Structure 1
């Protein structure tokens, strides 16, 4: 066949690229970073009315100051989260302090290219790249609120806002306009909620969508349905208002 870590003539790694195609088929995930915190929202996307929508966990807590959202082959994200959580706790044990959001992200991305069948560089024993992308959002005393996009390519970017998954290119353009350096947390919440509504196939409600944020004061919290449902209502109203 052809090496799992081969280069296309255009200078790209097939497996990583094909990996990205998979992520495109994933459920939408959006993150907005403001000076009042970072907001993370995701499209549950239950595949059947019998599936208990709240057993869908696409937003998880890395540490009290770091949380993340995933898109694509979500099963692949478990070991990533695990690695992340451990790295956070471990850092704290060794240094008596919180792991910087960028450092944590850098650590997760270090697993990215560790795949192959005998790649001369260490012991990269993983048959394929990860089929999921992550939005790592947190806060630290050095660079405040941060939003990161971690991909199977090993590279991670920092965004003020970012959308990944099925409705990404669409939602991304939206964020472009809507985002400004003085958004409030509440504005960002509604905003994410609105953009999810446009890209989602299903009619957004507090059951096929989930919000969450991370603020220096109370850290990472996942909004329980009731809390979100009202923001949904509040959004429909502000929209109908013009």
Structure 2
């Protein structure tokens, strides 16, 4: 898993890979790691997919309950506080490193939660296994007040560094852009590893696998 987040001129840009490996074997090739938290708060997650989905869904329902109560849009500091409280209450057994990013009346906001509960608010953050190979790119190319196109090029490039140089990441680039009004989530922003050496479709004319006894049930 490799998740990056970049604060640009107005809003934030989050990116992630798609490969999910279940113990040294690629289980799914197009898993989605950019969850939803609010109309203006997205949350990438790295580590154990179980906890990353569980805590995100928990606080995502809590925020919805809350904004139905108050009536205002939800603040990213509330989501960050809920997440960090829950994570610290379990002493890191809930192993989900999260990148939480949204837009408020206070401008963009992009923070990162370690699995132990500690938070940092930075201009750009990266988490996951290929977090060292992706950060290497952001340090080399992040200038202040980038336009949306530049932030998306930068996030795609920072992901393609973890895609190619890390074994536990790759096969695609998920890039979501959050602004004050909208939030557009493009799934296949870049697919470098293209579908080479086409399949041969081995042909087995139905019946070659012997069957002993069959009960068909019409409905």
Alignment TM class, shorter chain as reference? 0.7 to 0.9
CA distance in 2 between counterparts of 1:165 and 1:115 reads 20
CA distance in 1 between counterparts of 2:141 and 2:20 reads 28
Q: Would you say how many aligned residue pairs link Structure 1 and Structure 2? A: 187
Residue in 2 that maps onto 1:144: 107
> What is the CA RMSD across the aligned residues, in angstroms?
2.5
CA distance in 2 between counterparts of 1:46 and 1:91 reads 32
SS of the aligned residue for 1:129 comes to: coil
* Structure 1 unaligned blocks of 5 or more: 1-26, 117-127, 233-242
Residue in 1 that maps onto 2:8: 34
Q: Give TM-score, length-normalised by structure 2.
A: 0.76
1:187 aligned onto 2:150: yes
CA apart distance, 1:49: 10
SS of the aligned residue for 1:137 comes to: strand
**Greater helix proportion:** 1
CA apart distance, 1:216: 1.1
CA apart distance, 1:44: 1.2
**Greater strand proportion:** 2
**Which of 109, 113, 118 matches 2:84?**
109
Residue in 2 that maps onto 1:23: none
Counterparts of 1:1-242 in structure 2, within 5 Å, are 27-47=1-21, 53-54=29-30, 56-115=31-90, 129-141=93-105, 143-201=106-164, 208-219=172-183, 221-225=184-188, 228-229=189-190
Larger radius of gyration: 2
CA apart distance, 1:198: 1.7
CA apart distance, 1:94: 2.1
Q: Give TM-score, length-normalised by structure 1.
A: 0.69
* Structure 2 unaligned blocks of 5 or more: 193-219
CA distance in 2 between counterparts of 1:33 and 1:106 reads 20
Is 2:10–2:107's contact at 8 Å kept on the other side of the alignment?
Answer: no
